[PDB]
Amino acid sequence: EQGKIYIVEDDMTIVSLLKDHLSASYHVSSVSNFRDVKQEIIAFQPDLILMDITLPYFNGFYWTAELRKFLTIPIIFISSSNDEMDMVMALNMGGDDFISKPFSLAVLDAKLTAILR
Amino acid sequence: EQGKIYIVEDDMTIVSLLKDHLSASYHVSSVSNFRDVKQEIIAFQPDLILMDITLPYFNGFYWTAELRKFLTIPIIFISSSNDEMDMVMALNMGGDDFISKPFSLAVLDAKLTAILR
């Protein structure tokens, strides 16, 4: 009965890192097929999505707006240190929060805790 | 046809129409291999890029940010009339203007003339 987190990320290092860390406290799944994310989300029923918006061949901006037609669950963006994002931007893009790479797991933990309640 | 325009677009109908319309005034190229877009842009050396930011599996904002590490040329985003794209977003993501599908060719022509001036 742990909270379910779905991770949209193509970097297997990052995915492994997050699965290792978060699995103690959450049911964590990552994308299997990037062309099937709507079905994967319908089937998995996550409580929260971690959405990397820096993936070259998965348009995180497009897909967040598409998912927002259907979902009210929190979406936390994973952004780049390079990129300069803020909460106004995150909200206008359909997100609830953001965290920039490279990030501390401690900061991610605090954000996950606060948001999931 | 001296000005060079590169179009990042996977709708082949839009590419065909734009190539045909712009042929009179511009040297126009589009994507040959979506795995090699950055390299094609480096090879073609456009004066302007039309970057569709609605492609589900090519992250237009990511690639604009990558291109902005070494190009200062104008980039006009192609968006969708029902999405949340506005000028604040266009400029914040490294673009210089945007045009929303479906769009007027007269508006595109005016935008191209103005920003290539």
- H or E element, residue A37: helix A37-44
**What tokens were used for A36?**
């099937």
Among the listed residues A77, A69, A55, A76, the one whose alpha carbon sits nearest the alpha carbon of residue A10: A55
Distances from the Cα of B73 to the Cα of B4, B33, B96, angstroms: 11, 22, 9
Contacts of A98 (CB under 8 A, 6+ apart): A76, A77, A78, A79, A85, A87, A90
Q: Which amino acid is at B17?
A: L
Resolution of the experimental structure, in angstroms: 1.4
Q: Supply the DSSP symbol for A83.
A: G
CA-nearest residue of chain A to B80? Answer: A62
CA-nearest residue of chain B to A37? Answer: B56
Domains of chain A are 1-117 (3.40.50.2300)
Encode chain B in three state secondary structure. CCEEEEEECCCHHHHHHHHHHHCCCEEEEECCCCCCHHHHHHHHCCCEEEEECCCCCCCHHHHHHHHCCCCCCCEEEEEECCCCCCHHHHHHCCCCEEEEECCCHHHHHHHHHHHCC
- H or E element, residue A29: strand A27-30
For residues B108 and B5, the answer to whether their CB atoms sit within 8 Å is no
Among the listed residues A105, A4, A89, the one whose alpha carbon sits nearest the alpha carbon of residue A45: A4
Owner of token pair 């456009």? B46
* Dist. CA B11–CA B55, nearest whole Å: 9
For residues A56 and B63, the answer to whether their CB atoms sit within 8 Å is yes
Contact residues, B window 17-56, toward A, CB-based 8 Å cutoff: 34, 53-56
SS3 A7: strand
* Dist. CA B20–CA A80, nearest whole Å: 38
For residues A76 and A55, the answer to whether their CB atoms sit within 8 Å is no
Q: How many residues does chain B have?
A: 117
* Dist. CA B47–CA B72, nearest whole Å: 9
The number of helix segments (H) and strand segments (E) in chain A equals 5, 5
CB contact under 8 A, B58 and A53: no
Q: Which long-range contacts (CB under 8 A, 24 or more apart) does A33-38 make?
A: A34/A10, A34/A58, A34/B57, A35/B57, A37/A8, A37/A63, A37/A67, A38/A66, A38/A67, A38/A70
* Dist. CA A99–CA A81, nearest whole Å: 9
The DSSP bridge partners found for residue B104 are none
Q: Return the beta strands (E) in A40-103 as ranges.
A: 48-52, 75-80, 97-101
For A83, the closest of B34, B60, B65 (CB atoms) is: B65
Which technique was the structure solved with, according to the deposited record?
X-ray
